[PDB]
Amino acid sequence: KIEEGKLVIWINGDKGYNGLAEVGKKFEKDTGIKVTVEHPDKLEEKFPQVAATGDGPDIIFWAHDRFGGYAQSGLLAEITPDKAFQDKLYPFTWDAVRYNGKLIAYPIAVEALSLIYNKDLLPNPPKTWEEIPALDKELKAKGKSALMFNLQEPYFTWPLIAADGGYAFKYENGKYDIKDVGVDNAGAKAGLTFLVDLIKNKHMNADTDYSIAEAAFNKGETAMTINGPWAWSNIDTSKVNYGVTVLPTFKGQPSKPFVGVLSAGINAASPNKELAKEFLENYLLTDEGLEAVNKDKPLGAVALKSYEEELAKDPRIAATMENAQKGEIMPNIPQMSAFWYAVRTAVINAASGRQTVDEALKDAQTRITMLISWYMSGYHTGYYMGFR
């Protein structure tokens, strides 16, 4: 049950929830109104359970990708920032927080893969994927390799597959088209081809996984890897002199890593929606509010322009943002589950020579198209009947 005249906030235990509590303490000093921050266990399971009965927190913080599920279940209120408020944040971040074209959360922070490089082996990392084969032959003369990154998980190989036109679902006019899937187009094929022949030509090994690639980079055996901000604290400990930069281009187009956006939704059942807006818009989403959170536990790159400009003095955080701006927002729809599953197989099969590139992606597209067409029958029959 859901107390009026105060805010309850849930946010994950690995965030700066003590910093967020200082923002709640400022709100109260200014306003007289109490803010309570909690970090329950298993919060993203607990939220849709408790909020369906029309209880829960007023505000929930989590990765945007799961809010598409919450919104679809009617658990998130539509938010109402004005145009001037929208303008304070990088415009691509509002595209991560829509459901049925309506805004359903405030973007807070942004995360994406970047190119991580050893500055001692490689003072200037390559601008293009095309140059990596030659760079590799040159480094292998020193007993070093050019690049090693997790090849087993589509999240890591997608940025190259997407560079030339690959995509999960087409996004147009604030909305995904679930019938327009871009896994077997000519872009995806050209990229996966370039990848598979790095392996054929012996510049990568089809078996390289997350820990193998992380050990090589942190032992100074390879000049480059591809990883996110969660990896930087291991690289600091390794004392490798590293830098973090823009991903290489492919056919002159930017690599397109998937982008995760830590967001704040408002419970559809809260009687404090205007209070939640005021707290989010005028206290948290300000340079002093993001600073308090980030000082407790770093946020990485943030959606608020004014504060990202301060953070982006760290070139590593600048690189994350540049790569995120160039990347593909992770679609927040439940059909994204079909993609992970089909594409993981396709890549692992193209990579190991089990299938050709053209064959592995063609079949991926088929499987995804089929799972969704079945999902939507489930839907048109769940619906017409659930109504009665």
Place this chain on the structure above:
Amino acid sequence: KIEEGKLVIWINGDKGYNGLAEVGKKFEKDTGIKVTVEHPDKLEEKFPQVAATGDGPDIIFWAHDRFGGYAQSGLLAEITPDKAFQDKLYPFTWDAVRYNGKLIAYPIAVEALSLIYNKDLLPNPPKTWEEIPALDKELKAKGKSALMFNLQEPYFTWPLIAADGGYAFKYENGKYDIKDVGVDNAGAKAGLTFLVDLIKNKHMNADTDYSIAEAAFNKGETAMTINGPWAWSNIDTSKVNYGVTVLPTFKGQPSKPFVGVLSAGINAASPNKELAKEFLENYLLTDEGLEAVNKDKPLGAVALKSYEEELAKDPRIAATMENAQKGEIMPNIPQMSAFWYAVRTAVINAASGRQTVDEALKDAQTRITMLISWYMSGYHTGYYMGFR
């Protein structure tokens, strides 16, 4: 709109609808009440369209497999024959006309594959599948083959795959369990194995399709084929001296062809449900009523014991019934679409050596399990939301 005090009946243009009209004329002589028989074009598309708006015929005749769809959309009334009436029909036929364990149609006639044989080449057709390899070597000395039937379509190869324990969905207590699929169990594997090695050993060709098998049998080139009653009129024209008999056993178990049951449902929106029951139970489902239909266009084997015993003087119609009693009722649920699609691939791949038997069925089971699990999310999300 849906006139009270008379019956409107729809039945397909390839049935004995003029014979059914004579039953309607008897009802009227006895009863004073008018019966109108129609055979619209595209009736099984037209029925769920018109009956949703709560119009249509009082009674619709079609293959039972599509009534599961109609029932699920609330377009069929639950029927209420008593126990004594149920007893007039072979008990396995009432298992083809349930939805959510409730009766939703009256079984009229039954169809299934049988073993068709050339009596001149083969006066005694083999009792077991195991004996076909030796029989083949013996016939090939005469320039003849033992068996040829469509291998491209799972409907035709399923009876052997099912013999030893293969199944689509498990049926228990009047209901299918959509989570219990039996395509990769040890039964299905043993059967498909026996099939694939008939091809490896050169007794069958993986490329044989419907017309190839039909030409061979009707030219007297092969001693046996597997086909249904729709094929008998071509074999009559060929003047081959043929017989129709029980399918061979495999590991001592009966082959299990899928069974189609021509059934009669009652429109949920009809005000004449008691009239429709009376017409179906006391006029159509009697020996004089089935005779009038069958005299116009043969029904094949029928569900009514008293009349099937007259028909079963034709050994060909007896064979159809014996095979149907031994076979697997075609499941009437919409998830059966997942089966056709996955199993067709599995068989064609095991057959051509693209995959092993163990691998092709394992993957079939996976694909079917996945499509249904996606269908049912579509469903649990279509539902909970459609309600609101």
